[PDB]
Design an enzyme around this catalytic site. Structure first.
Site, short mmCIF file in Angstrom:
data_model
loop_
_atom_site.label_atom_id
_atom_site.label_comp_id
_atom_site.label_asym_id
_atom_site.label_seq_id
_atom_site.Cartn_x
_atom_site.Cartn_y
_atom_site.Cartn_z
N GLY A 176 0.80 -1.23 0.00
CA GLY A 176 0.00 0.00 0.00
C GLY A 176 0.82 1.27 0.00
O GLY A 176 0.28 2.37 -0.11
N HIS A 177 2.15 1.12 0.10
CA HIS A 177 3.06 2.30 0.19
C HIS A 177 3.67 2.66 -1.17
O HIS A 177 4.36 1.81 -1.77
CB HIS A 177 4.12 2.05 1.25
CG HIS A 177 3.58 1.54 2.56
ND1 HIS A 177 3.23 2.38 3.61
CD2 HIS A 177 3.35 0.28 3.00
CE1 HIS A 177 2.79 1.65 4.62
NE2 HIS A 177 2.87 0.37 4.28
#
Lengths: 208, 207, 205
Positions: free
Chosen positions: A77-78
Site C-alpha cells: 500500500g506504500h
C-alpha cells in the site's frame, strides 16, 4: 509453545501449509524450531482468500531454514513515488475518504526445485530463484537468483556458481526432481556425489 | 520470558545446560527481548555427542539479546554434491542409499572480554580473539583477531580497539586470569583507558 | 497470544505506547503481528521512570514494519576505549565494588514525519531520520538520514532520494502533516500523486 518438537526436526511443507496462495512441491521441508511457528507465518502478508494477489510457489526438494521470511503483498500500500508513503486508503478515518489505493503487486515469488534457503533469509516480493540455488543465512534477496547460483549478504549478491556451465545445463536438462521414484531411489549414491556428468550420461541412455 | 527485566543480565554459567557449551565466569547474556535462556542461542548443538563441533566462550563476555551461534556444520547439506537436500536425514525409504552429508566445521571459540551485539550471528567454526567487538546484526563468517571490531553481513574489519603495542601488553598481562584479589584491586584501573599504567603496575607485581 | 489480531492489522502508536520517554505523533502506526508484541518492546532499553536518558521522538504519519528495533540506552554501559568492555559497574559481585559507571548518552532518537520504516530494520542509538525518509527492511541505520532519502543495507547506505532537490524544498516548506485535518480531506487525491509542484502552488494562494 512450539510447532516443532526438536531443533533437528524438519517437517515437509505439504504437511503444514494451509494458505491456498502457497503452492509447494514434494519433500521440501521447513526447519522451524528456533522461531516457533509453522511455515504459514514465514509467508508474510499473503491473503489466503484472494485470487488476485502475488502467490508463492516452491518447487520440490527444498531445504528451508529457521525463521526464513517470504515477503508478499507487494508494496503493502506504500507508494514512494507519491507525495506520502502513508497508506491513507487503508486507514479508516473519515478524512482519508478520497484516497487512492496505493497497493501495487510485484509478481509471484517462485522458488525452484532443490533450493537451500539459510536461516533468517528474507526474500523480497516478486523474486524468482532458480533450481539448485543457495541463499546464505541472513541474506536479503532483492532480485532474481540464477539456477545453481550461490548468493548472500544484504542486499544479496553473487558469490559463485555451484558447478560449471556444462554441469548446470546437464542438471536443468535431466531434471532429476521429475524422475520416476524408482529412478530417484536408484540414484541416491550419485546424487550424494559431485558426479553430474556420469549421472547425466547414465540418464541419457535410460531416458532418450 | 526467561529474563525478569530488559536490563537483566544473567551469567552464562547460571543458565547453560548443554554439555557441549563451555563457559567462563562472569560472562553474561541479556536475552529479555528474545525470551529464551542462553541454550537456545546455540543452534543445532547435540548435547549427548562427544564428536561434534563445540562452543567455547571465555571470561568477561557480554552477549546481547538474541545473538546466535550456529553449530552442526553444514547441517547435512553439501553444496558440492548434486543436491543439497539432506536425503540421509529424511524419513523415507526411497532415500535408503543416501550418504551422510554432515561435515563439521571445527569448534566455535570466543575468547575473553568479547562483547557481542544483539542479534549478531556467529557461523560454525569461527574463532573470535580476546577483547574483540562484534557489532549488532553482524554476520560473522571468518575469524576475528584480538581487540578487533567488525560489523556488517558478512562481517568486515572496522577498527582495532588499540595500537599493536597496547594489544601486546594486554595479551601478555591477561587480567582475566589474575587472582581475584588483584582483580578487585584493579577495578578503577580497568575502567580506564590507561593500558600502559596497568601494564607497568602488573610487571612489578608479577615478574 | 499476540498483540495484533491479523497480519494486516496496524494499530496507531499513540494507542499502544505506555512509556513516557517515547513521544509519538498522530496517525503513525506499528504493524506488528509477526513479532507478537506492542510497540513498547520495539523500543529497547528505554527506562520509563527517568528524565536523564535518551528519548524516542517519532513524527506523525509514520509507517513502521513488524519487528522494527529502536536501540536506546546509548552504549549500554560498555566503553570500548576502556580496557574491558565488561560492565563491572552494572553487575553484582563484591569484587566489582570500585568500578566506574561506563554509561554514556547518545542523544535522542528522532524520526521525522512521513517516515516509512521497513520490517525488522534496526535504528542505532542517537540517530536522526528526516521527513519522508524510507528505511529499507533489515536496514541497520547507524547514521542520520536526509529528508526524503531512501537507505538500505547493514550498515545502511544511500540508495537515492525520492524527489528532486526543489521538490524536497517544497515539501519541507509546505509541511502538509501539520495542516488541519479538514484541508487534508480536500487534498487526498493530490497526496496520492506525484504532483509536488501542483500542490505547492495550491498551498500558497
Amino acid at each position: 509453545m512450539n510447532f516443532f518438537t526438536s531443533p533437528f526436526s524438519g517437517i515437509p511443507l505439504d504437511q503444514q501449509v494451509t494458505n491456498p496462495n502457497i503452492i509447494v512441491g514434494k519433500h521440501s521441508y521447513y526447519s522451524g524450531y528456533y522461531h516457533g511457528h509453522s511455515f504459514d507465518d514465514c509467508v508474510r502478508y499473503l491473503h489466503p482468500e484472494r485470487d488476485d494477489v502475488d502467490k508463492l510457489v516452491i518447487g520440490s526438494f527444498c531445504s528451508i531454514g529457521s525463521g526464513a521470511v517470504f515477503m508478499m503483498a507487494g508494496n503493502q500500500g506504500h507508494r514512494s513515488d507519491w507525495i506520502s508513503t502513508f497508506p491513507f486508503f487503508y486507514q479508516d478515518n473519515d478524512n482519508f475518504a478520497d484516497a487512492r489505493d496505493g497497493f501495487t503487486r510485484s509478481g509471484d515469488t517462485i522458488i525452484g526445485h532443490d533450493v537451500w534457503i539459510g536461516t533468517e533469509a528474507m526474500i523480497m516480493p516478486g523474486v524468482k530463484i532458480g533450481h539448485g540455488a543457495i541463499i546464505a543465512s541472513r541474506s536479503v534477496v532483492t532480485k532474481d537468483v540464477a539456477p545453481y547460483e550461490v548468493v548472500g549478504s544484504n542486499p544479496a549478491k553473487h558469490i559463485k556458481f555451484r558447478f560449471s556451465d556444462v554441469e548446470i545445463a546437464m542438471l536443468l536438462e535431466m531434471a532429476w526432481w521429475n524422475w520416476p521414484e524408482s529412478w530417484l531411489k536408484e540414484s541416491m549414491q550419485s546424487l550424494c556425489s559431485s558426479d553430474i556428468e556420469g549421472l547425466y550420461l547414465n540418464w541419457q541412455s535410460k531416458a532418450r
